[PDB]
Subunit: 318 residues, 3 copies
């Protein structure tokens, strides 16, 4: 009948060496929050949550702001949250680079501030979904559905959704006097994923398919994407990970394109509240845009070459 109040956070600190650039030091995506939960009876519980950022860069601001109601019929969560998409994710186990090949948030950056989200667990067969209120085109249209289920040692999921931005930035031409090109884009995407636990080892594979149509315009981009990845706990506190990520983008204009991302890294944990990371990442070719869930990094649509990247992490959790 009573409740729990958890005050939690991370203090990320990163040292990064990215292709063609200088060393950076500073915060990663440090944040701090408060999960408050209260069980009323057996068919009713309540949640109040609010995470905010402690990045070293801009003004500080709220990241998630949530009212949750759990029932017999499932949990409904309301307000500013990450997309159901991002919660489900897919097979990327990096803390820096990588996450390309998951194509759910080309337009969303994994976020919609004005959304309703549903969850339902069972004899671990589960269902998650969400809807984004466009709050009169101040926000994106969003709608997603995923479903999964574990078979003892195998773990599966599939689903997708549809996200649209009426005024999304597609380019720039300045002429002196600097302006960007807006355009109304729809991203309609689907995935399937499997994960296999072999004691220390873990393997994962995801396939993403995705369609970017533009209204008042013939253009269409079919993306088709394969992530394969895994982790292996070696010593007592030590985990290694890696992944290959291959993406192909056909345009309806004929124009074909691809992109490759490879990573290899190590999570050591002095404790659970004290972790350090080291990761290499090789990239070549094109992304249309992606989010690394581990760093919270956004990479906007780009083409890379010859592309080496190292990242050294040190976090304090609470």
């Amino acid at each position: 009948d009573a409740g729990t109040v958890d005050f939690y956070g991370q203090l990320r600190t990163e040292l990064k060496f990215l292709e063609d650039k200088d060393p950076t030091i500073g915060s990663g995506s440090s944040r701090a929050g408060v999960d408050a939960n209260y069980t009323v009876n057996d068919s009713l519980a309540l949640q109040g949550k609010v995470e905010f950022a402690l990045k070293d860069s801009g003004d500080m601001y709220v990241r998630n702001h949530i009212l949750g109601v759990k029932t017999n019929f499932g949990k409904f969560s309301f307000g500013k949250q990450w997309t159901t998409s991002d919660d489900v994710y897919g097979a990327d186990y990096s803390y820096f680079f990588g996450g390309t090949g998951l194509r759910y948030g080309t337009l969303s950056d994994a976020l919609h501030d004005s959304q309703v989200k549903y969850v339902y667990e069972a004899d671990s067969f589960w269902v998650k979904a969400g809807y984004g209120f466009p709050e009169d085109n101040a926000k994106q249209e969003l709608a997603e559905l995923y479903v999964g289920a574990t078979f003892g040692d195998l773990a599966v999921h599939a689903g997708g959704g549809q996200n649209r931005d009426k005024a999304f930035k597609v380019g720039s031409n300045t002429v002196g006097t600097t302006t960007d090109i807006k355009a109304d884009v729809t991203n309609s995407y689907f995935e399937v994923t499997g994960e296999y636990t072999i004691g220390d080892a873990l393997i994962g594979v995801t396939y993403y398919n995705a369609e970017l149509d533009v209204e008042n315009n013939p253009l269409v981009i079919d993306e088709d994407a394969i992530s394969v990845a895994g982790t292996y706990k070696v010593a007592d506190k030590t985990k290694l990970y890696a992944g290959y990520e291959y993406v192909m983008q056909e345009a309806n204009t004929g124009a074909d394109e691809d992109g490759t991302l490879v990573y290899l890294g190590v999570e050591y944990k002095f404790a659970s509240w004290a972790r350090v990371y080291a990761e290499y990442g090789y990239g070549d070719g094109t992304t249309l845009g992606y989010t690394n869930k581990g760093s919270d990094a956004e990479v906007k649509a780009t083409k890379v070459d010859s592309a080496n990247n190292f990242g050294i992490g040190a976090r304090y959790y609470w």
Copy 2:
């Protein structure tokens, strides 16, 4: 001789349906604060207060930032606070719409960040006042005085003040190239209010009068405003409320104008830390601008028509 340190807050979450618009979900005006109080002796106590916002929208920022000193001669509070005006308020018992007819903050939005405020309670006959430092026209001129007193079951107040903005936005014409019209406006206002408690019931009536002159210009707007309102606790945790609010604006140019706001709603409280709200609001005609104290909503000067509005609230307090 010792002190109290209260860490407090609200986690508002609102679902709103306003005339001619789409559904919104998200935070209302969530905030969080710290009241710190310390009694030194019988003729001396100290306060330190700082509230900040957790809205789901912009950067997060400080709302109130206060140093208070209580004495025999009364409490002096210093720094960023709401106007004495707003503290006193008048008869509006809504959580969303309504608050028109209180005319104290057409220009202030109920706030001055650089003000000194005085309070004095007695054999409950009380006096409140405040002054806003213009800090060289970076801020509004403000000066207010209110006085009240309870007669057992009747509760009265009257007062007003004068607030001026040297560069207040009166309109816009863009021509291609988008610009707004500034103008130096004075709002000089007075009210009287009475409130009557009949066990479960509560009735309230306020009258506001107000004068907007403009310097270097003939224009003047006399507002004259009548709020009447009340609440009635029905069941164990249930309160109902309503109000009629009628405002008339004569201009000195001849031009007459009016505005009507009606509300009806219900506060249910699962507990004191858990409340839910439902409110209807009908509006027709003109406001020159107003603040709803219950939602923290600002409505800028506007004319409405045919105007239906619903609002469903859910807050967690601490």
Copy 3:
């Protein structure tokens, strides 16, 4: 082997009367933070720190964001911190005006958000240093080294560094259409300081020398600066302080210039968590720009005259 978690802060409130201006009230530089420390063994400790602002003015934001590692070989601190320079400071004991004559941060405002800092204490002979990562000219080049040592009752330090901004604001001409003049400036500075404790009394003297060269341009400004200052605890809770600060700026163009700052004030402390300040400050002539460490005030490059300033402070610490 365990750790300490300190939640700390200040609630500054200031009332200021500066030459040619109106009274201001409001916050000074209120902030709040969390120092977290953990000793692992005798040759290893860890720190996590994050201070953020509660100013009454803009958005709220992070001030310092730190990962510290202490060893036998010394403490390395990483991320957003004040400059080593500012930590060391020099002889200014004011809470408002004064701090001119310390010339370390003409360009930095005492801050670099992307810096590595080293510290080493001994049989109190100490060494501090730091490097600022230019993170590809998004940030200033910085590099500093200071060293000190106490002789029982005398306390000495000397050092300096070099700080450069590729695009620093040197002026403005608007022509209608408002633009500022950027220019690539280097500030290369050195100091020596001594401090003498005579029970209640304290005396201090600093000398600063500094050179501002500009790339692609003949201009150079030699500053040469003498602060002399002190404090004297009179009654039980009462401290008085004062300082004379004289600065001379030769330009390489011939053009000579100077500036004088004098202060006198009193720190009374009702307790350690409750302090009040009163300070007078006389200024005449030129600063090229400076920071008062006590108020956190930035004064941009300016020439003053006839210049009287009072400041009344009231802080609550925790």
